[PDB]
Each structure stands twice: as C-alpha cells, then as structure tokens.
CSV table of C-alpha atoms in Angstrom, one decimal:
chain,number,residue,atom,x,y,z
A,15,UNK,CA,225.7,-30.4,117.9
A,16,UNK,CA,223.4,-27.5,117.6
A,17,UNK,CA,220.3,-29.2,118.8
A,18,UNK,CA,222.4,-30.4,122.0
A,19,UNK,CA,223.8,-26.8,122.4
A,20,UNK,CA,220.1,-25.4,122.4
A,21,UNK,CA,218.6,-28.0,124.3
A,22,UNK,CA,221.3,-27.3,127.0
A,23,UNK,CA,220.4,-23.5,127.0
A,24,UNK,CA,216.8,-23.7,127.0
A,25,UNK,CA,217.1,-26.2,130.0
A,26,UNK,CA,219.3,-23.4,132.0
A,27,UNK,CA,216.6,-20.9,131.1
A,28,UNK,CA,213.9,-23.2,132.6
A,29,UNK,CA,216.3,-23.4,135.8
A,30,UNK,CA,216.3,-19.7,135.9
A,31,UNK,CA,212.3,-19.5,135.4
A,32,UNK,CA,212.3,-22.0,138.5
A,33,UNK,CA,214.9,-19.9,140.4
A,34,UNK,CA,212.8,-16.6,139.9
A,35,UNK,CA,209.8,-18.6,141.1
A,36,UNK,CA,211.9,-19.6,144.3
A,37,UNK,CA,212.4,-16.0,144.9
A,38,UNK,CA,209.0,-14.7,145.0
A,39,UNK,CA,207.9,-17.7,147.1
A,40,UNK,CA,210.7,-16.3,149.8
A,41,UNK,CA,209.1,-12.9,149.3
A,42,UNK,CA,205.6,-14.1,150.1
A,43,UNK,CA,207.2,-16.3,153.1
A,44,UNK,CA,209.0,-13.4,154.7
A,45,UNK,CA,205.4,-11.4,154.7
A,46,UNK,CA,203.9,-14.7,156.2
A,47,UNK,CA,206.4,-15.0,158.7
A,48,UNK,CA,205.9,-11.3,159.8
A,49,UNK,CA,202.0,-11.6,159.7
A,50,UNK,CA,201.9,-15.0,161.3
A,51,UNK,CA,203.7,-13.8,164.7
A,52,UNK,CA,202.3,-10.2,164.5
A,53,UNK,CA,199.6,-10.8,167.4
A,54,UNK,CA,201.1,-12.7,170.0
A,55,UNK,CA,200.8,-16.3,168.7
A,56,UNK,CA,203.8,-18.6,167.9
A,57,UNK,CA,206.7,-18.5,170.4
A,58,UNK,CA,210.5,-19.0,170.1
A,59,UNK,CA,210.4,-22.7,168.4
A,60,UNK,CA,208.2,-21.5,165.5
A,61,UNK,CA,210.0,-18.1,165.3
A,62,UNK,CA,213.3,-19.9,165.2
A,63,UNK,CA,212.2,-22.6,162.9
A,64,UNK,CA,210.7,-19.9,160.3
A,65,UNK,CA,213.8,-17.7,160.4
A,66,UNK,CA,215.8,-20.8,159.8
A,67,UNK,CA,213.8,-21.9,156.5
A,68,UNK,CA,214.2,-18.2,155.3
A,69,UNK,CA,217.8,-18.0,155.8
A,70,UNK,CA,217.9,-21.7,153.9
A,71,UNK,CA,216.2,-20.0,151.0
A,72,UNK,CA,218.7,-17.1,151.0
A,73,UNK,CA,221.3,-19.7,150.7
A,74,UNK,CA,220.0,-21.8,148.0
A,75,UNK,CA,218.8,-18.8,146.0
A,76,UNK,CA,222.4,-17.8,145.9
A,77,UNK,CA,223.5,-21.2,144.7
A,78,UNK,CA,221.0,-21.3,142.0
A,79,UNK,CA,222.3,-18.2,140.5
A,80,UNK,CA,225.9,-19.6,140.7
A,81,UNK,CA,224.6,-22.8,138.9
A,82,UNK,CA,223.2,-20.7,136.0
A,83,UNK,CA,226.5,-18.8,135.7
A,84,UNK,CA,228.5,-22.1,135.7
A,85,UNK,CA,226.3,-23.7,133.2
A,86,UNK,CA,226.4,-20.8,130.9
A,87,UNK,CA,230.3,-20.5,131.2
A,88,UNK,CA,230.6,-24.4,130.5
A,89,UNK,CA,228.2,-23.8,127.2
A,90,UNK,CA,230.1,-20.9,126.1
A,91,UNK,CA,233.4,-22.6,126.6
A,92,UNK,CA,232.0,-25.9,124.8
A,93,UNK,CA,229.9,-24.6,122.1
A,94,UNK,CA,230.6,-21.0,121.3
A,95,UNK,CA,234.4,-20.8,121.7
A,96,UNK,CA,235.0,-23.4,118.9
A,97,UNK,CA,232.9,-21.1,116.5
A,98,UNK,CA,234.5,-17.8,117.6
A,99,UNK,CA,238.1,-19.1,117.8
A,100,UNK,CA,238.4,-19.3,114.0
A,101,UNK,CA,236.7,-15.9,113.3
A,102,UNK,CA,239.4,-14.3,115.5
A,103,UNK,CA,242.2,-16.5,114.3
A,104,UNK,CA,241.3,-14.9,110.8
A,105,UNK,CA,242.9,-11.5,112.2
A,106,UNK,CA,246.3,-13.5,112.0
A,107,UNK,CA,246.1,-13.6,108.0
A,108,UNK,CA,245.5,-9.7,107.7
A,109,UNK,CA,248.5,-8.0,107.5
A,110,UNK,CA,249.0,-5.2,109.8
A,111,UNK,CA,252.3,-4.5,108.5
A,112,UNK,CA,251.1,-2.2,105.7
A,113,UNK,CA,251.8,0.8,103.4
A,114,UNK,CA,249.0,3.5,102.5
A,115,UNK,CA,248.2,1.5,99.4
A,116,UNK,CA,247.0,-1.3,101.7
A,117,UNK,CA,245.5,0.9,104.3
A,118,UNK,CA,243.4,2.6,101.4
A,119,UNK,CA,242.3,-0.9,100.1
A,120,UNK,CA,240.9,-1.7,104.0
A,121,UNK,CA,239.4,1.6,104.1
A,122,UNK,CA,237.6,0.4,100.6
A,123,UNK,CA,237.0,-3.3,101.7
A,124,UNK,CA,237.1,-4.0,105.2
A,125,UNK,CA,239.6,-7.1,105.6
A,126,UNK,CA,238.2,-8.7,109.0
A,127,UNK,CA,236.0,-6.7,111.4
A,128,UNK,CA,233.0,-6.1,109.8
A,129,UNK,CA,232.7,-9.7,108.7
A,130,UNK,CA,233.6,-10.7,112.2
A,131,UNK,CA,230.7,-8.4,113.6
A,132,UNK,CA,228.3,-10.1,111.2
A,133,UNK,CA,229.4,-13.5,112.3
A,134,UNK,CA,228.8,-12.5,116.1
A,135,UNK,CA,225.3,-11.1,115.1
A,136,UNK,CA,224.1,-14.2,113.5
A,137,UNK,CA,225.4,-16.4,116.4
A,138,UNK,CA,223.9,-14.2,118.7
A,139,UNK,CA,220.4,-14.1,117.0
A,140,UNK,CA,220.1,-17.7,117.6
A,141,UNK,CA,220.0,-17.0,121.2
A,142,UNK,CA,217.9,-13.9,121.7
A,143,UNK,CA,214.8,-15.9,120.2
A,144,UNK,CA,215.2,-18.6,122.7
A,145,UNK,CA,216.3,-17.3,126.0
A,146,UNK,CA,215.1,-14.9,128.8
A,147,UNK,CA,216.7,-11.4,129.0
A,148,UNK,CA,218.8,-12.2,132.1
A,149,UNK,CA,220.1,-15.6,130.5
A,150,UNK,CA,220.6,-13.8,127.0
A,151,UNK,CA,222.7,-11.3,128.8
A,152,UNK,CA,224.8,-13.3,130.9
A,153,UNK,CA,225.7,-15.2,127.9
A,154,UNK,CA,226.4,-12.1,125.8
A,155,UNK,CA,228.8,-11.1,128.7
A,156,UNK,CA,230.7,-14.5,128.6
A,157,UNK,CA,230.9,-14.2,124.7
A,158,UNK,CA,232.1,-10.8,125.1
A,159,UNK,CA,234.7,-11.8,127.5
A,160,UNK,CA,235.6,-14.6,125.2
A,161,UNK,CA,236.3,-12.2,122.5
A,162,UNK,CA,238.7,-9.8,124.4
A,163,UNK,CA,240.8,-12.8,125.7
A,164,UNK,CA,241.1,-14.6,122.2
A,165,UNK,CA,241.7,-11.0,120.4
A,166,UNK,CA,244.5,-10.4,123.0
A,167,UNK,CA,245.9,-13.6,122.1
A,168,UNK,CA,245.8,-13.1,118.1
A,169,UNK,CA,247.4,-9.7,118.5
A,170,UNK,CA,250.3,-11.2,120.6
A,171,UNK,CA,250.9,-13.3,117.4
A,172,UNK,CA,250.7,-10.4,114.8
A,173,UNK,CA,253.3,-8.1,113.3
A,174,UNK,CA,252.8,-4.3,113.4
A,175,UNK,CA,254.0,-1.3,112.1
A,176,UNK,CA,252.9,2.3,112.5
A,177,UNK,CA,250.1,2.3,110.0
A,178,UNK,CA,249.1,-1.2,111.0
A,179,UNK,CA,248.7,0.1,114.8
A,180,UNK,CA,246.2,2.8,113.1
A,181,UNK,CA,244.1,0.0,111.1
A,182,UNK,CA,243.9,-2.0,114.6
A,183,UNK,CA,242.8,1.1,116.3
A,184,UNK,CA,240.0,1.6,114.0
A,185,UNK,CA,239.1,-2.2,114.2
A,186,UNK,CA,239.3,-2.4,118.0
A,187,UNK,CA,236.8,0.7,118.2
A,188,UNK,CA,234.6,-0.6,115.7
A,189,UNK,CA,234.5,-3.9,117.7
A,190,UNK,CA,233.7,-2.3,121.3
A,191,UNK,CA,231.4,-0.1,119.5
A,192,UNK,CA,229.4,-3.1,118.5
A,193,UNK,CA,229.6,-5.2,121.7
A,194,UNK,CA,228.2,-2.1,123.4
A,195,UNK,CA,225.1,-2.0,121.5
A,196,UNK,CA,224.2,-5.8,122.5
A,197,UNK,CA,224.0,-5.1,126.0
A,198,UNK,CA,223.2,-2.7,129.0
A,199,UNK,CA,226.4,-3.1,130.5
A,200,UNK,CA,229.8,-1.2,130.0
A,201,UNK,CA,232.3,-3.2,128.5
A,202,UNK,CA,235.3,-0.6,128.9
A,203,UNK,CA,236.8,-2.7,131.8
A,204,UNK,CA,236.8,-6.0,129.8
A,205,UNK,CA,238.3,-4.2,126.7
A,206,UNK,CA,241.1,-2.0,128.8
A,207,UNK,CA,243.7,-4.5,128.1
A,208,UNK,CA,243.3,-4.6,124.4
A,209,UNK,CA,242.9,-0.5,124.6
A,210,UNK,CA,246.2,-0.1,126.2
A,211,UNK,CA,247.7,-2.5,123.4
A,212,UNK,CA,246.2,-0.2,120.7
A,213,UNK,CA,248.1,2.8,122.5
A,214,UNK,CA,251.4,0.8,122.6
A,215,UNK,CA,250.9,0.0,118.9
A,216,UNK,CA,250.5,3.6,117.8
A,217,UNK,CA,253.3,5.0,119.4
A,218,UNK,CA,255.7,6.8,117.0
A,219,UNK,CA,258.9,5.6,118.4
A,220,UNK,CA,259.7,3.1,121.5
A,221,UNK,CA,260.6,5.8,123.9
A,222,UNK,CA,257.3,7.5,123.6
A,223,UNK,CA,255.7,5.0,125.8
A,224,UNK,CA,257.6,7.0,128.8
A,225,UNK,CA,255.2,9.9,128.1
A,226,UNK,CA,252.3,7.8,129.4
A,227,UNK,CA,254.1,5.7,131.9
A,228,UNK,CA,255.1,5.8,135.5
A,229,UNK,CA,255.1,9.6,136.8
A,230,UNK,CA,253.6,10.7,133.5
A,231,UNK,CA,250.9,8.0,133.9
A,232,UNK,CA,248.5,10.8,134.9
A,233,UNK,CA,245.1,9.5,134.4
A,234,UNK,CA,245.5,6.1,132.9
A,235,UNK,CA,246.1,3.0,135.1
A,236,UNK,CA,247.9,0.5,133.3
A,237,UNK,CA,246.5,-2.9,133.5
A,238,UNK,CA,249.6,-4.3,131.6
A,239,UNK,CA,253.0,-5.3,133.9
A,240,UNK,CA,256.3,-3.9,132.4
A,241,UNK,CA,256.9,-7.4,130.7
A,242,UNK,CA,253.7,-7.4,129.1
A,243,UNK,CA,254.3,-3.4,128.0
A,244,UNK,CA,257.8,-4.9,126.1
A,245,UNK,CA,256.0,-7.9,124.6
A,246,UNK,CA,253.8,-5.5,123.0
A,247,UNK,CA,256.2,-2.9,121.9
A,248,UNK,CA,258.1,-5.8,120.3
A,249,UNK,CA,255.0,-6.6,117.9
A,250,UNK,CA,256.1,-3.3,116.3
A,251,UNK,CA,258.4,-4.9,113.6
A,252,UNK,CA,260.0,-1.2,113.3
A,253,UNK,CA,260.7,-1.0,117.3
A,254,UNK,CA,264.4,-2.3,118.2
A,255,UNK,CA,264.4,-5.5,120.4
A,256,UNK,CA,267.7,-3.8,122.2
A,257,UNK,CA,265.9,-0.8,122.8
A,258,UNK,CA,262.8,-2.3,124.0
A,259,UNK,CA,265.1,-4.2,126.6
A,260,UNK,CA,266.9,-1.2,128.0
A,261,UNK,CA,263.6,1.1,128.5
A,262,UNK,CA,263.5,2.1,132.0
A,263,UNK,CA,259.9,1.0,133.0
B,14,UNK,CA,190.3,-10.0,168.9
B,15,UNK,CA,191.2,-13.4,170.1
B,16,UNK,CA,189.4,-15.3,167.5
B,17,UNK,CA,190.7,-13.0,164.9
B,18,UNK,CA,194.0,-13.3,166.1
B,19,UNK,CA,193.5,-17.3,166.0
B,20,UNK,CA,192.1,-17.2,162.2
B,21,UNK,CA,194.8,-14.8,161.1
B,22,UNK,CA,197.5,-17.2,162.4
B,23,UNK,CA,196.0,-20.4,161.0
B,24,UNK,CA,195.3,-18.6,157.4
B,25,UNK,CA,198.8,-17.3,157.5
B,26,UNK,CA,200.2,-21.1,158.2
B,27,UNK,CA,197.9,-22.4,155.6
B,28,UNK,CA,199.5,-19.8,153.2
B,29,UNK,CA,203.0,-21.3,154.1
B,30,UNK,CA,201.6,-24.7,153.5
B,31,UNK,CA,200.6,-23.4,149.8
B,32,UNK,CA,204.5,-22.1,149.3
B,33,UNK,CA,206.0,-25.3,150.6
B,34,UNK,CA,203.9,-27.1,148.2
B,35,UNK,CA,205.3,-24.9,145.5
B,36,UNK,CA,208.7,-25.4,146.5
B,37,UNK,CA,208.4,-29.3,146.3
B,38,UNK,CA,206.8,-29.0,142.7
B,39,UNK,CA,209.8,-26.6,141.6
B,40,UNK,CA,212.2,-29.2,143.2
B,41,UNK,CA,210.4,-31.9,140.8
B,42,UNK,CA,211.1,-29.5,137.9
B,43,UNK,CA,214.3,-29.1,138.8
B,44,UNK,CA,215.3,-32.8,139.3
B,45,UNK,CA,213.9,-33.3,135.6
B,46,UNK,CA,215.9,-30.2,134.3
B,47,UNK,CA,219.2,-31.6,136.0
B,48,UNK,CA,218.8,-35.0,133.9
B,49,UNK,CA,218.0,-33.3,130.8
B,50,UNK,CA,220.8,-30.7,131.4
B,51,UNK,CA,223.6,-33.6,131.3
B,52,UNK,CA,221.7,-36.0,128.9
B,53,UNK,CA,223.7,-34.9,125.5
B,54,UNK,CA,227.3,-34.7,126.5
B,55,UNK,CA,227.5,-31.2,127.5
B,56,UNK,CA,228.1,-30.3,131.0
B,57,UNK,CA,231.4,-30.4,133.5
B,58,UNK,CA,232.2,-31.4,137.0
B,59,UNK,CA,231.2,-27.8,138.6
B,60,UNK,CA,227.8,-27.7,136.9
B,61,UNK,CA,226.8,-31.2,137.9
B,62,UNK,CA,228.3,-31.1,141.8
B,63,UNK,CA,226.6,-27.6,141.9
B,64,UNK,CA,223.1,-28.8,140.7
B,65,UNK,CA,223.2,-31.8,142.9
B,66,UNK,CA,223.9,-29.4,145.9
B,67,UNK,CA,221.2,-27.1,144.9
B,68,UNK,CA,218.9,-30.2,145.0
B,69,UNK,CA,220.0,-31.8,148.3
B,70,UNK,CA,219.5,-28.2,149.8
B,71,UNK,CA,215.9,-28.1,148.6
B,72,UNK,CA,215.1,-31.3,150.0
B,73,UNK,CA,216.4,-30.2,153.4
B,74,UNK,CA,214.3,-27.0,153.6
B,75,UNK,CA,211.2,-29.0,152.6
B,76,UNK,CA,211.7,-31.0,155.7
B,77,UNK,CA,212.1,-27.9,157.4
B,78,UNK,CA,209.0,-26.4,156.3
B,79,UNK,CA,207.1,-29.7,157.3
B,80,UNK,CA,208.7,-29.1,160.8
B,81,UNK,CA,207.4,-25.5,161.2
B,82,UNK,CA,204.1,-26.3,160.0
B,83,UNK,CA,203.8,-28.8,162.7
B,84,UNK,CA,205.3,-26.5,165.3
B,85,UNK,CA,202.9,-23.6,164.0
B,86,UNK,CA,199.9,-25.7,164.4
B,87,UNK,CA,201.0,-27.6,167.8
B,88,UNK,CA,201.6,-23.8,169.3
B,89,UNK,CA,198.2,-22.7,167.9
B,90,UNK,CA,196.3,-25.5,169.5
B,91,UNK,CA,198.1,-25.0,172.9
B,92,UNK,CA,197.6,-21.2,172.8
B,93,UNK,CA,194.3,-20.6,171.1
B,94,UNK,CA,192.2,-24.0,171.3
B,95,UNK,CA,193.1,-25.4,174.9
B,96,UNK,CA,192.1,-22.1,176.6
B,97,UNK,CA,188.7,-22.4,174.9
B,98,UNK,CA,188.1,-26.2,175.3
B,99,UNK,CA,189.7,-26.8,178.7
B,100,UNK,CA,186.7,-25.0,180.7
B,101,UNK,CA,184.2,-26.7,178.2
B,102,UNK,CA,185.7,-29.9,179.6
B,103,UNK,CA,186.1,-28.9,183.3
B,104,UNK,CA,182.4,-28.6,183.0
B,105,UNK,CA,182.0,-32.4,183.3
B,106,UNK,CA,183.0,-31.9,186.8
B,107,UNK,CA,179.7,-29.9,187.7
B,108,UNK,CA,177.5,-32.5,186.1
B,109,UNK,CA,176.5,-35.0,188.8
B,110,UNK,CA,177.4,-38.7,187.8
B,111,UNK,CA,176.2,-40.2,191.2
B,112,UNK,CA,172.6,-40.3,190.1
B,113,UNK,CA,169.1,-42.1,190.4
B,114,UNK,CA,166.7,-42.9,187.8
B,115,UNK,CA,165.0,-39.3,188.4
B,116,UNK,CA,168.3,-37.4,187.6
B,117,UNK,CA,169.0,-39.8,184.5
B,118,UNK,CA,165.6,-39.1,183.4
B,119,UNK,CA,166.2,-35.3,183.5
B,120,UNK,CA,169.5,-35.5,181.6
B,121,UNK,CA,167.5,-37.1,179.0
B,122,UNK,CA,165.2,-34.5,178.5
B,123,UNK,CA,167.9,-31.9,178.9
B,124,UNK,CA,171.1,-33.1,178.3
B,125,UNK,CA,173.4,-31.6,181.1
B,126,UNK,CA,177.1,-31.5,179.3
B,127,UNK,CA,177.9,-33.2,176.1
B,128,UNK,CA,175.5,-31.7,173.5
B,129,UNK,CA,176.6,-28.4,174.3
B,130,UNK,CA,180.4,-29.4,174.4
B,131,UNK,CA,179.4,-30.9,170.7
B,132,UNK,CA,177.9,-27.6,169.4
B,133,UNK,CA,181.0,-25.5,171.0
B,134,UNK,CA,183.2,-27.9,169.0
B,135,UNK,CA,181.3,-27.7,165.8
B,136,UNK,CA,181.5,-24.0,165.8
B,137,UNK,CA,185.3,-24.4,165.7
B,138,UNK,CA,185.7,-27.2,163.5
B,139,UNK,CA,183.3,-25.5,160.9
B,140,UNK,CA,185.4,-22.1,161.3
B,141,UNK,CA,188.6,-24.3,160.4
B,142,UNK,CA,187.1,-26.5,157.7
B,143,UNK,CA,186.1,-23.2,155.9
B,144,UNK,CA,189.4,-21.3,155.8
B,145,UNK,CA,191.9,-24.1,155.7
B,146,UNK,CA,193.5,-26.8,153.2
B,147,UNK,CA,192.6,-30.4,154.0
B,148,UNK,CA,196.4,-31.1,155.1
B,149,UNK,CA,196.1,-28.4,157.3
B,150,UNK,CA,192.6,-29.0,158.7
B,151,UNK,CA,193.1,-32.6,159.2
B,152,UNK,CA,196.5,-31.9,160.9
B,153,UNK,CA,194.5,-29.8,163.1
B,154,UNK,CA,191.6,-31.6,164.1
B,155,UNK,CA,194.1,-34.6,164.9
B,156,UNK,CA,195.5,-32.4,167.5
B,157,UNK,CA,192.3,-31.2,168.6
B,158,UNK,CA,191.0,-34.8,169.2
B,159,UNK,CA,194.2,-35.9,171.2
B,160,UNK,CA,193.9,-32.9,173.4
B,161,UNK,CA,190.2,-33.7,174.2
B,162,UNK,CA,191.1,-36.9,174.8
B,163,UNK,CA,193.6,-36.1,177.3
B,164,UNK,CA,191.5,-33.2,179.2
B,165,UNK,CA,188.3,-35.3,179.5
B,166,UNK,CA,190.5,-38.2,181.1
B,167,UNK,CA,192.0,-35.7,183.6
B,168,UNK,CA,188.3,-34.4,184.7
B,169,UNK,CA,186.9,-38.1,184.7
B,170,UNK,CA,189.6,-39.0,187.4
B,171,UNK,CA,188.4,-36.2,189.5
B,172,UNK,CA,184.8,-37.2,189.4
B,173,UNK,CA,182.2,-39.4,191.3
B,174,UNK,CA,180.2,-42.3,189.5
B,175,UNK,CA,177.5,-44.7,190.7
B,176,UNK,CA,176.1,-47.3,188.3
B,177,UNK,CA,173.7,-45.3,186.6
B,178,UNK,CA,176.1,-42.1,186.5
B,179,UNK,CA,178.4,-44.7,184.7
B,180,UNK,CA,175.7,-45.5,182.1
B,181,UNK,CA,175.2,-41.7,181.6
B,182,UNK,CA,179.3,-41.6,181.2
B,183,UNK,CA,179.0,-44.3,178.5
B,184,UNK,CA,176.4,-42.4,176.6
B,185,UNK,CA,178.2,-39.0,176.6
B,186,UNK,CA,181.3,-40.7,175.5
B,187,UNK,CA,179.9,-42.6,172.6
B,188,UNK,CA,178.0,-39.2,171.7
B,189,UNK,CA,181.5,-37.4,171.7
B,190,UNK,CA,183.4,-39.9,170.0
B,191,UNK,CA,180.5,-40.2,167.1
B,192,UNK,CA,180.8,-36.4,166.5
B,193,UNK,CA,184.8,-36.3,166.7
B,194,UNK,CA,184.8,-39.4,164.1
B,195,UNK,CA,183.0,-37.1,161.5
B,196,UNK,CA,186.0,-34.7,161.6
B,197,UNK,CA,189.2,-36.8,162.1
B,198,UNK,CA,190.6,-40.0,160.9
B,199,UNK,CA,190.0,-43.8,162.2
B,200,UNK,CA,193.0,-43.1,164.7
B,201,UNK,CA,190.3,-41.5,166.8
B,202,UNK,CA,189.7,-45.1,168.2
B,203,UNK,CA,193.1,-45.3,169.5
B,204,UNK,CA,193.0,-41.8,170.8
B,205,UNK,CA,190.0,-42.5,172.6
B,206,UNK,CA,191.0,-46.3,174.1
B,207,UNK,CA,191.9,-45.4,177.5
B,208,UNK,CA,188.7,-43.4,177.8
B,209,UNK,CA,186.5,-46.1,176.3
B,210,UNK,CA,188.2,-48.8,178.4
B,211,UNK,CA,187.6,-46.3,181.5
B,212,UNK,CA,183.6,-46.5,180.7
B,213,UNK,CA,183.9,-50.2,180.5
B,214,UNK,CA,185.2,-50.1,184.2
B,215,UNK,CA,182.7,-47.6,185.3
B,216,UNK,CA,179.8,-49.5,183.8
B,217,UNK,CA,180.7,-52.7,185.6
B,218,UNK,CA,177.9,-54.1,188.5
B,219,UNK,CA,180.4,-55.3,190.8
B,220,UNK,CA,184.3,-55.1,191.0
B,221,UNK,CA,185.1,-58.8,190.3
B,222,UNK,CA,183.0,-58.4,187.1
B,223,UNK,CA,186.1,-56.9,185.7
B,224,UNK,CA,188.1,-60.2,185.8
B,225,UNK,CA,185.5,-61.2,182.9
B,226,UNK,CA,187.5,-58.7,180.6
B,227,UNK,CA,190.9,-58.8,181.9
B,228,UNK,CA,194.1,-60.9,181.1
B,229,UNK,CA,193.4,-64.1,179.6
B,230,UNK,CA,189.7,-63.0,179.3
B,231,UNK,CA,190.5,-60.1,177.2
B,232,UNK,CA,190.0,-61.6,173.8
B,233,UNK,CA,190.9,-59.2,171.1
B,234,UNK,CA,191.3,-56.3,173.4
B,235,UNK,CA,194.7,-54.7,174.5
B,236,UNK,CA,194.2,-53.2,177.6
B,237,UNK,CA,195.8,-49.5,177.7
B,238,UNK,CA,195.3,-49.1,181.6
B,239,UNK,CA,198.0,-50.6,183.8
B,240,UNK,CA,196.5,-52.6,187.1
B,241,UNK,CA,197.4,-49.5,189.2
B,242,UNK,CA,195.2,-47.3,186.6
B,243,UNK,CA,192.6,-50.0,186.8
B,244,UNK,CA,192.1,-49.8,190.5
B,245,UNK,CA,192.1,-45.9,190.2
B,246,UNK,CA,189.3,-45.9,187.9
B,247,UNK,CA,187.5,-48.8,190.1
B,248,UNK,CA,187.8,-46.4,193.1
B,249,UNK,CA,185.7,-43.4,191.2
B,250,UNK,CA,182.7,-45.7,191.5
B,251,UNK,CA,181.6,-44.8,194.9
B,252,UNK,CA,179.7,-47.9,195.5
B,253,UNK,CA,182.9,-50.2,195.1
B,254,UNK,CA,184.7,-51.2,198.1
B,255,UNK,CA,188.2,-50.3,198.4
B,256,UNK,CA,188.8,-53.8,199.9
B,257,UNK,CA,187.3,-55.5,197.1
B,258,UNK,CA,189.6,-53.2,194.3
B,259,UNK,CA,192.7,-54.2,196.5
B,260,UNK,CA,191.7,-57.8,196.4
B,261,UNK,CA,191.9,-58.0,192.4
B,262,UNK,CA,194.7,-60.2,191.4
B,263,UNK,CA,195.2,-57.9,188.2
C-alpha cells in the first residue's frame, strides 16, 4: 500500500518535471517564431503553421496541469483519506458536553487536536521529502480541504454545551494555525464554514444568533443556509428544538 | 543583409527542430509515466482519460512541427536560394553548345560554366553544413538538388546543340551530378533522370539512333520523357531534320 502510494506520487512528480520542460520549450519557440519572421523571410503559410503549433502547446500545457491536479485528488482520496478519516473520527469520542473539571483536564492534557496535528505532520513529512514544491503544495492543499470537509462532518455528529463550544473554538483555532504554517496560501476560505459553526456553538442562547444575522450581519458573510444554521444550533444540547425551529432567519 | 537574413532564418528553424526533438523525447518519457502511473491499482477514469488525451495531443503537435519545418525550408529555398541559383543556371544559355573542336578545346582549357557553378553551390552548401543539424541540412540539400534539376532542364530546352555541343553537355552534366551526389542522397539519380535522358538524346549521331534505346530497346531503362518531349529535345539539335523527328514511331 505505502509503496504503491509513493510510486503514484513520484510518477506524477515526473509528469510535472516534463510539463515544466514543455513550458520552457514553448517559451524558446515563441522567441524563435518572432526571430524567424523578423527579416522578411517566411510567408503566410509558415506564420500560420507556427501560430497553430504555439496555440497547441498552450492548450496541452493547460491539460497537463489539469492532469496533475486530477492525479493528486485521486491519490488524496484513495491513499490519504483512509488514514486521516480515523483521526478525524476520534473527535466524536471526545466529549464536548463538559463541566469545568473536564475542561481543566483538557487544558492539562489535550484530548484530540495536538495528536491530530502530530499525525498530519508525520504523514506530510513522507511527501515533502520526495516531491517538488508545486506538487507537495498542491497535495497539502487537497489534504487541508479534506480535513475541513471531514471535520465538519464529525462536528455535525457531536454534542455540545457552552463550555464544549469554547473547547471546540480553541481546537479549531489550533488546527487552522498549524495548517497555515505548512503552506504559503491562506486557508481562511476553506475553514470559513467551520469558523461560522464555532461562532454558533459559542452562543450564550439561541436567540443570540439574531445579533449576527440578516440586517445585523454587518461584516460577516454567512456561508451557511438558514437550514444549516438550525442544524448547528441543534448540536447544542441546551438549545431547545422548538426555539430553534421558530427562530426567524 | 540578405546572406545574414538567410542564415538567421536557417539557424532559427534549426532551433525549432531541436525543440521538436525535445518534445518527442518528453512524449516518450510521458508514455512510460502513464503506464507506470496506473500499474499498481491506483488511478481512476478521469486521470486515465486526461493522460491519454495529453499524449494524443503531443502526437498531433509533433506532426504539426514536422509540417512547419518542411514549410519553413521550402519557403527559404524559394525566397533566398532560388534567386541566387537561377542566374547561375541561366548563364548556361550564354555558352554556345553549337561548337567545333577549336571551341570544344577552348572549353577544356577554360571551363565556361559548370566549374564556377559548382564553386557557387559549394560556397552555399558549406555555409549550411557548418550551421545546421544533419536532418535540416539533408532536407535543404534535397530541395536544392530538385531546384537545380528543374531550372537546368528549362535552360537546356531553350538552348541550341550540335553533336560536339551535346558532348560538352554530357561532361558538364556528369560533373554537376558528381558534385551534388556528395551533398545529398542516392535519390539524386531519379531527380536528374530527365536531364540524363535529355543528354542521351543530345548525344545521338542521327535522329533514327534514338530507336536503339527506345521502347522495346529500353532494356533496364524507364524513360521519363513522353514522345512529345523526346521530339522537343531532338529539335534542340540544329543538325537534326524536323522531317526525321516527325517520322519517328515513338
């Protein structure tokens, strides 16, 4: 399994080297085209054939980048997802319906996020050693998206109280901080849904959502539908179903 | 300027050839990558379809690059080579081929056309050989060989011969072919087949002697001249009677 995974990646990495070489040749050829016709030799037929060649190289160069992205998303889904999924699922077994004694226990011995980060670090270390930056970065980006998607799914299965919401806010901010260190990209957009869920899960009372919603939305652009907002409010065990359903969103 | 424009064009086109060969070697590496990628049970429908499409596209563009190179070389030949070569060939017209021994001997002592023509060609060929890859150089000399054959045929058909003039032409043609043979492939024989056959006709002792070499009497030779063209070439001999030429059953 590990062999077949790394072979796939190393092969894609060589596709990327070849693709970069095609781009460098295209640039040499663009300069050749200008030089070739610069002194009155070469008519319409040669000029049209050269333009057509260059256009074809632009087109296939775009296709090679798409191939690489497709390869990496398939690798991520086939080989990385099966490893990450259990680590994310572990969140479900950490109570987020907690009193101060448990919250203080969690402050002293972190129950999930720190080990999750260590697991991601080890996993990603295998790739950074063997892949070019462009490939490593793209793969890291896919892993980051996978983490946001799967974390959202396990949160939606979990039960919170107010202090558990506070715990989740710390865990989420820690995770986003780590994933930010491993890339040059901003991951704020990828984590916007989770950040908005953390806001909901930290409300003092159901009706407090109205302070951040609709006309009072102000800065924040909600990525969640009213139905999704109600689904997240419902994760709070202290938030009454009847009250959530009747909320004017 | 026009020599430097010509050489700049050729050197640039030669670089295009180097690039296209590099594309071909990359395509080969990529074909091996595609096989290796799917060899261990990872990879789905989309990655397979995309990779196959990428390779098909590289195949298509390699064909277009070959087309471009050939177009480039034929235009260079027409634009930069033909205008130098045409005057050199047209000079044949000013050399009498209706001659007696005194003039034939003059020509032996001081060659009137072909040796300078060969020198003129050599200077071009050597310029090309020093700056171009074998593939481009060979393609270019093939185009040049064809051009010389076409243009020399035209000027011959405008010229007047007697027997000894025909003998002079046979020497001149054999020297030219001997030279060109050293810069192109064996196809020179086919390119110059019409001219060699014209030389045979221009070296006949009498009109009826053509029947010794024609039709059933061809032997291994396949004539590349029509009956009308044979009569046209016979007519270049000022000593040959129109009546006799028309008599021939070809």
